[PDB]
Design a protein around this ligand. Structure first.
Ligand SMILES: *C/C=C(C)/C=C/C=C(C)/C=C/C1=C(C)CCCC1(C)C
Ligand SMILES: CCCCCCCC/C=C\CCCCCCCC(=O)O
Ligand SMILES: CCCCCCCC/C=C\CCCCCCCC(=O)O
Ligand SMILES: CCCCCCCC/C=C\CCCCCCCC(=O)O
Ligand SMILES: CCCCCCCC/C=C\CCCCCCCC(=O)O
Ligand SMILES: CCCCCCCC/C=C\CCCCCCCC(=O)O
Ligand SMILES: CCCCCCCC/C=C\CCCCCCCC(=O)O
Ligand SMILES: CCCCCCCC/C=C\CCCCCCCC(=O)O
Ligand SMILES: [Cl-]
Ligand SMILES: [Cl-]
Length: 264
């Protein structure tokens, strides 16, 4: 049901996609160790924001690892090209993983925005419901990326509605709570918003690839877009969230944070 299954791949195409996924694994698990070691310099009220980056690194790293092995399982070099065998490859498992990873990305944002208690629980709940609506409708949509492009487009429009509303909740909370933030991170959090708008928008572009580039090179392009998007939305994002957490920790008087920033 996926466009990947439609084509044979050149050695170059096949190996490049393998390398993209493998590099993806390496970057996320390398970042994992960084987040782990810097977590001790985060104040208790923000430390979970850095823990969530560890959780996202392993979750994302595992899905990329799984995709890479699925890729090599599904294709074998036969008569001069990589051809589909008995096992299958699908990006559908990425969508399932987003059900977990996107709530984690959203939660760590709410934490460094200094949301607490009732507002935190209510905002997270609405955000996660919007996100799940987006992911589920998008998942249904990509079931038709070969059979019914029109249906892909309509489910995509519904998903985009959830996306836009989710982004509005995010922006509203960011620009409202920006003033509460310490150590100059009121400025930093503004860049985080724009990073999210940029990086998360790469995913619907990848979703539309079967509509505007239904060939083997389109398959490469989509994996390339996912790679840019994953690294930006999880790793670069996580680094900014952790920076914000440490900076606010230091400004709040947490001595390990002050000491850590002092060494650099
Ligand atoms: C780490 C993974 C992330 C941040 C994934 C984000 C995914 C999206 C923003 C997906 C958006 C979609 C649309 C807005 C329309 C087409 C269907 C989706 C689900 C690909
Ligand atoms: C930086 C270099 C990126 C690697 C290019 C791989 C594409 C190829 O070799 O076919
Ligand atoms: C934050 C951005 C992270 C970027 C990650 C992607 C790094 C590698 C990017 C690709 C370089 C272009 C490779 C040339 C493609 C050759 C075409 C092919 O062989 O199929
Ligand atoms: C392989 C990676 C090993 C990582 C172990 C690092 C332990 C961190 C110690 C700590 O800060 O609590
Ligand atoms: C095939 C029916 C798809 C139903 C989509 C359900 C939308 C999910 C909304 C928020 C949870
Ligand atoms: C909750 C939203 C559920 C779906 C809204 C209906 C619009 C998209 C469904 C398309 C159905 C189809 O194309 O057959
Ligand atoms: C051409 C790859 C880069 C596309 C970035 C633009 C999409 C996000 C816009 C906000
Ligand atoms: C080419 C540009 C690629 C961008 C690479 C991003 C790298 C890591 C981001 C680190 C986040 C630090 C937050 C900003 C620090 C500060 O505000 O002074
Ligand atoms: Cl604290
Ligand atoms: Cl993920």
């Amino acid at each position: 049901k996926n466009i990947e299954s439609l084509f044979d791949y050149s050695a170059g195409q096949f190996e490049f996609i393998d390398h993209l996924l493998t590099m993806g694994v390496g970057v996320h698990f390398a970042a994992l160790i960084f987040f782990l070691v810097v977590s001790q310099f985060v104040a208790p009220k923000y430390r979970i924001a850095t823990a969530l980056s560890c959780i996202v690194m392993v979750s994302a790293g595992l899905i990329l690892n799984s995709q890479a092995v699925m890729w090599t399982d599904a294709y074998a070099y036969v008569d001069g090209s990589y051809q589909l065998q008995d096992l299958t490859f699908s990006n559908g498992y990425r969508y399932v993983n987003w059900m977990a990873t996107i709530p984690c990305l959203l939660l760590q944002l709410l934490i460094v925005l200094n949301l607490k208690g009732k507002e935190l629980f209510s905002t997270a709940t609405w955000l996660i419901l919007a996100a799940w609506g987006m992911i589920i409708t998008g998942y249904v949509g990509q079931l038709y990326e070969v059979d019914d492009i029109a249906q892909l487009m309509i489910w995509g429009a519904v998903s985009t509605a959830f996306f836009v509303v989710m982004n509005w909740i995010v922006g509203t909370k960011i620009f409202k709570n920006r003033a509460t933030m310490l150590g100059g991170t009121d400025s930093t959090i503004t860049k985080v918003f724009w990073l999210m708008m940029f990086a998360w928008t790469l995913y619907p572009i990848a979703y539309l690839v079967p509509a505007f580039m239904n060939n083997a090179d389109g398959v490469v392009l989509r994996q390339l877009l996912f790679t840019i998007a994953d690294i930006s939305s999880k790793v670069i994002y996580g680094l900014m969230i952790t920076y914000i957490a440490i900076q606010q920790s230091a400004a709040a008087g947490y001595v390990p944070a002050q000491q850590a920033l002092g060494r650099i």
